[PDB]
Amino acid sequence: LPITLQRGALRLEPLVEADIPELVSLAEANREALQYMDGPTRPDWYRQSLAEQREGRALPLAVRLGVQLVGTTRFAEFLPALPACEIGWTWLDQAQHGSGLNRMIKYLMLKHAFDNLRMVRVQLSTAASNLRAQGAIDKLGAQREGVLRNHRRLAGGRLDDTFVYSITDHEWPQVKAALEASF
């Protein structure tokens, strides 16, 4: 079920059709930053996430900081029987990199997955080539679970492997603690 997540001027709100033109314009200005992701520069990647939201299979979000739309992120790949999900499909306008915005977003999202939704597992994933997102996943305290070969494309169409990580419900108290103490 759709949620708005907020801390002060930071709002994560369900993605809507009206957000798409601006996200595509914002992604063009960040074209090079988005090089390890396939889709975010095209409307179909956003429309796909809203299709899935309708089918109860994703919760995509618009990231707003004050008045300004600064990116997007998503819960998806639900495993209802566990429950489990993945958090990802995140990009942020590059003025926000290094700011702590990503850590805060991930803290609000994990806190929802574990404290409210009762997830037993949360997966995070990124391209083998994406050294920045890897560092950022590390900093969360997610543990690497695997390397999936020939599992993705980069923005220019090149094939890449995926690094897969997770946080389990047992690890979450210490993950929560560690993040909160970095604020």
Ligand X SMILES: CC(C)(COP(=O)(O)OP(=O)(O)OC[C@H]1O[C@@H](n2cnc3c(N)ncnc32)[C@H](O)[C@@H]1OP(=O)(O)O)[C@@H](O)C(=O)NCCC(=O)NCCS
Among 69, 120, 128, 155, binds its own copies (CB under 8 A): 120
Q: Per CB under 8 A, does 159 bind its own copies?
A: yes
User: Is residue 33 involved in binding its own copies (CB under 8 A)?
Assistant: no
Chosen from ligand X, its own copies, none, partner binding at 109 (C-beta under 5 to 8 Å by type): none
In whole angstroms, how close is the CB of 28 to ligand X at the nearest point?
13
The reply on whether position 49 binds ligand X by CB under 6 A is: no
Q: Would you list the DSSP string of the chain?
A: ----EEETTEEEEE--GGGHHHHHHHHHTTTTTTTTSSSTTSHHHHHHHHHHHHTTSEEEEEEEETTEEEEEEEEEEEETTTTEEEEEEEEE-GGGTTSSHHHHHHHHHHHIIIIIS--SEEEEEEETT-HHHHHHHHHHTPEEEEEEEEEEE-TTS-EEEEEEEEEETTTHHHHHHHHHHT-
Site map (CB under 6 A) of ligand X, residues 89-128, x = contact: -xxx----xx---xx----------------------x--
Would you count residue 177 as binding its own copies (CB under 8 A)?
Answer: no
Number of residues that bind ligand X (CB under 6 A): 20
Binding-site ranges for its own copies (CB under 8 A)? 38, 79, 81-82, 84, 120-121, 123, 143, 145-153, 159, 164, 166, 168-169
